[PDB]
Nucleic acid binder design. Structure first.
Ligand SMILES: Nc1ncnc2c1ncn2[C@H]1C[C@H](O)[C@@H](COP(=O)(O)NP(=O)(O)OP(=O)(O)O)O1
Ligand SMILES: [Mg+2]
Ligand SMILES: [Mg+2]
Length: 431
DNA sequence: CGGATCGAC
DNA sequence: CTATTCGATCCG
């Protein structure tokens, strides 16, 4: 299906739903927030622009002088992960458009199915109108967890302090390994086919060995970026996907040529909204994000343009900080409509139990409790409450969440809360 | 601290 | 029928 009929059936199948109501309502807030930003752009003077241009470029120099090309960062990323796993272990599904999910939602889809526009975060029933030969197949998370464990075993040989960002993804710092690998015999870097193969001394070659070894161990392909920092590496991981690599060599000129024409969306952390907002200023590539740096220092907060300047100069993180301790834990469930008050309490109590069980497993006790309610028109509320002494057991949590939900049914009274999702989150853990 | 929004997988 | 855990950030 073509790049016009896709958008045409999505609209055809979304039109007039309670969900699409809420999507239009979210679109206005965004367009308004843009309209407000264009009001500010109108009332920015020339003297302010030149006043900022100096202050920004004083900081840009502070960044540029401390640029760091000494480290070799790799990003590994599995291809069509949940789909690949399901394809691997069910031969029939190969050479056929699949998607892991339910009719309600799709985690992912394989590349065959992506040519019909079916993608991650699409509902099933829409993906079936886009492609009636789509086989939707339920997720087996425990397999995907097991498979991930198999790749993390390989990745640990190259950087034992690697950073598993997810099941399917990971940042590595292979700098220490590249120095050690320079003077290794062919015995230490030979691998047999599941008949023998050796891999070189270069970084390209280390990553070719890694990707090779994953394929022997899991029968799954992965893609990989190479670059002097994490931000770049993540983007060149996407470059030659599926089943490929890219290296941005460690020199300023090579960094900048890659950056030069790079759409800002492809940077991790710039998403749908930011793209549309910056696009209203005529910024689509990374060089344009640089040119407009001064203007941006006035329209956006300090950290937000501090980020945009790192992006424009091709900069990012150059050492992986061993994943820190969590700030919150949560559980939430979607269902067909609930509206009787006593059911909603029962349901909350159940969530507060699961959340207590989970805390039990990691031994954590928090001070803040936060319910989340989403009604049949997809309008989300969040209601929170922080307490002196920490809490942890199913009763203590429920005690607090009960009252927050009381306030909500009582506020809409005499009308009932017609809700489709409920959640409970605990936060404010100790030092 | 409470609440909404954004973004990633 | 049918649109799914967590950190970061901004603002009151
Ligand atoms: N919105 C979502 N909701 C639930 N699960 C999701 C999801 N998006 C992704 N996942 C799950 C399903 C995915 O298998 C897994 C990895 O996410 P990616 O790396 O972003 N996507 P993939 O690897 O499938 O394709 P490729 O990387 O080739 O683009 O996370
Ligand atoms: Mg992937
Ligand atoms: Mg992005």
């Amino acid at each position: 299906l073509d790049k016009e009929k896709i958008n045409k059936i999505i609209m055809e199948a979304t039109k007039g739903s309670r969900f699409y109501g809420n999507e239009l309502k979210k679109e206005k807030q965004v367009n308004q927030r843009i309209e407000n930003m264009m009001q500010q752009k109108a009332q920015i003077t020339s003297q302010q622009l030149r006043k900022a241009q100096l202050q920004v470029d004083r900081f840009a120099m502070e960044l540029e002088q401390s640029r760091n090309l000494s480290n070799t960062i790799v990003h590994i990323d599995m291809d069509a992960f949940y789909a690949a796993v399901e394809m691997r272990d069910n031969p029939e599904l190969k050479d056929k458009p699949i998607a892991v999910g339910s009719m309600s939602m799709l985690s992912t889809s394989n590349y065959h199915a992506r040519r019909f526009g079916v993608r991650a975060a699409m509902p099933g029933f829409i993906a079936k109108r886009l492609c009636p030969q789509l086989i939707i197949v339920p997720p087996n998370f425990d397999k995907y967890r097991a498979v991930s464990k198999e790749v993390k075993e390989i990745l640990a040989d190259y950087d034992p302090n690697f950073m598993a960002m997810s099941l399917d993804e990971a940042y590595l710092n292979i700098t220490k390994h590249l120095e050690e690998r320079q003077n290794w015999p062919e015995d230490k870097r030979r691998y047999f086919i599941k008949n023998s193969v050796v891999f070189g001394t270069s970084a390209q070659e280390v990553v070719k060995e890694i990707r090779f070894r994953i394929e022997q161990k899991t029968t799954l392909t992965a893609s990989a970026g190479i670059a002097p920092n994490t931000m770049l590496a993540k983007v060149c991981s996407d470059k030659n996907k599926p089943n490929g690599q890219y290296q941005i060599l460690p020199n300023r000129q090579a960094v900048m040529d890659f950056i030069k024409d790079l759409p800002i969306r492809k940077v991790s952390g710039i998403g749908k909204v930011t793209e549309k907002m910056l696009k209203a200023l005529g910024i689509i590539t990374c060089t344009e994000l640089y040119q407009q740096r001064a203007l941006l220092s006035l329209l956006f907060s300090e950290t937000s343009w501090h980020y945009f300047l790192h992006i424009s100069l091709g900069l990012g993180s150059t050492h992986l900080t061993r994943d820190g301790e969590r700030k919150s834990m949560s559980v939430e469930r979607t269902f067909s409509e609930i509206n009787k008050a006593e059911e909603q309490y029962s349901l909350c109590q159940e969530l507060c139990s699961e959340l207590a069980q989970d805390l039990q497993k990691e031994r954590l006790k928090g001070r803040t409790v936060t319910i989340k309610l989403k009604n049949v028109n997809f309008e989300v509320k969040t209601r929170a409450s922080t307490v002196s002494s920490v809490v942890s057991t199913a009763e203590e949590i429920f005690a607090i969440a009960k009252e927050l939900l009381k306030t909500e049914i009582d506020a809409d009274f005499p009308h009932p809360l017609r809700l489709r999702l409920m959640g409970v989150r605990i936060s404010s853990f100790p030092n």
